[PDB]
Amino acid sequence: TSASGPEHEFVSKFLTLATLTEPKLPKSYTKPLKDVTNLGVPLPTLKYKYKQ
Amino acid sequence: AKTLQRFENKIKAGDYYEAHQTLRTIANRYVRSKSYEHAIELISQGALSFLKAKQGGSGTDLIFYLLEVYDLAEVKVDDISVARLVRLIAELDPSEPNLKDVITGMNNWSIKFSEYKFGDPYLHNTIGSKLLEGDFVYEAERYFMLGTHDSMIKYVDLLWDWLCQVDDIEDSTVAEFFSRLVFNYLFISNISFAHESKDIFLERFIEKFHPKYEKIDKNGYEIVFFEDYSDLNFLQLLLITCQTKDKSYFLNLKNHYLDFSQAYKSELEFLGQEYFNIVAPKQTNF
Numbered sequence A: 001t002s003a004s005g006p007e008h009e010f011v012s013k014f015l016t017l018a019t020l021t022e023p024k025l026p027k028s029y030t031k032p033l034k035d036v037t038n039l040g041v042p043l044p045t046l047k048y049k050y051k052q
Numbered sequence B: 001a002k003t004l005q006r007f008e009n010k011i012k013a014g015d016y017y018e019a020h021q022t023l024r025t026i027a028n029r030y031v032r033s034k035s036y037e038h039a040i041e042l043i044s045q046g047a048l049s050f051l052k053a054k055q056g057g058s059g060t061d062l063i064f065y066l067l068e069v070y071d072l073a074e075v076k077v078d079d080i081s082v083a084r085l086v087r088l089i090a091e092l093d094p095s096e097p098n099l100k101d102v103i104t105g106m107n108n109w110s111i112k113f114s115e116y117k118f119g120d121p122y123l124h125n126t127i128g129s130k131l132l133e134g135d136f137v138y139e140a141e142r143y144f145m146l147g148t149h150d151s152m153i154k155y156v157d158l159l160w161d162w163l164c165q166v167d168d169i170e171d172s173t174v175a176e177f178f179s180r181l182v183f184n185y186l187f188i189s190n191i192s193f194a195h196e197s198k199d200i201f202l203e204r205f206i207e208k209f210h211p212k213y214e215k216i217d218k219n220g221y222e223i224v225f226f227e228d229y230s231d232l233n234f235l236q237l238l239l240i241t242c243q244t245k246d247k248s249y250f251l252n253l254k255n256h257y258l259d260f261s262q263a264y265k266s267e268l269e270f271l272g273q274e275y276f277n278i279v280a281p282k283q284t285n286f
């Protein structure tokens, strides 16, 4: 419905602009794990305790 | 073959010190005369039956002995090398007090004797699973992240099961889990895993929570547009943006979602560096 029209329009337009030509890296792109030098930035801890 | 029997006799009898001591002095003799394959088979088999017999201390000691010989004999990381370690990891009690030491030992050998900075991926797949059995969730995550395609499956399951355990779910709750797949796979530049795990995860989310959504498709790319999960839209767009390596799209995206830009400040600064060569630091919006 039209309560989220603004964000729908924005997402749709952004997707069109982003895919006017084939993106530099294809979906199937994988950096060989041999070449991975670092692991980026630490992600936050989750609030939730973990069980099973 | 013959002293393997004398050994597993001493193990059925519960003579653990004799079994251990005898095997070690016999293993020493093989190492001494440079018969490394013999020492490797004896030591690993020995480790296995201590672990099967719930003798963590002696089996663990023999795993370290194996790794010492692996290092001595300059045993390269290959399928046979790794399978010996995988077979052993299987029999390790998740509770073993030195589990993490053993894991680090194995991984460190795989770093030294391969071209992986962080260790063999196939080995990581098994280590990951063990760690998860011990509820070492954050360690499992890392090893899966650095694992194989199977690891990616296991990782999604890890995250999905965890989200389902959460008693009071929320709009920001789903993103806390989903963002982890997008970020981690973007960090190691596995776009393929990023896409594939996003698809598994979002499908399961749709089938369980029945959110309001519509699939937007343009030139073979798809965003699942959620009416009530802005975070989820942003995260999907982020992945495609990184693929384009276009700074202006990256900027546009951030300018539209000011809050998410603040929430993912350090992640986004790194992605800006990795995918867009942005040298300028993040100017803090607040």
Ligand code: PRO
Pocket (backbone or CB within 6 Å): B034, B035, B036, B037, B038, B039
């Ligand atoms: O370790 C080696 O290389 C030899 C071959 C079988 C066992 N001893």
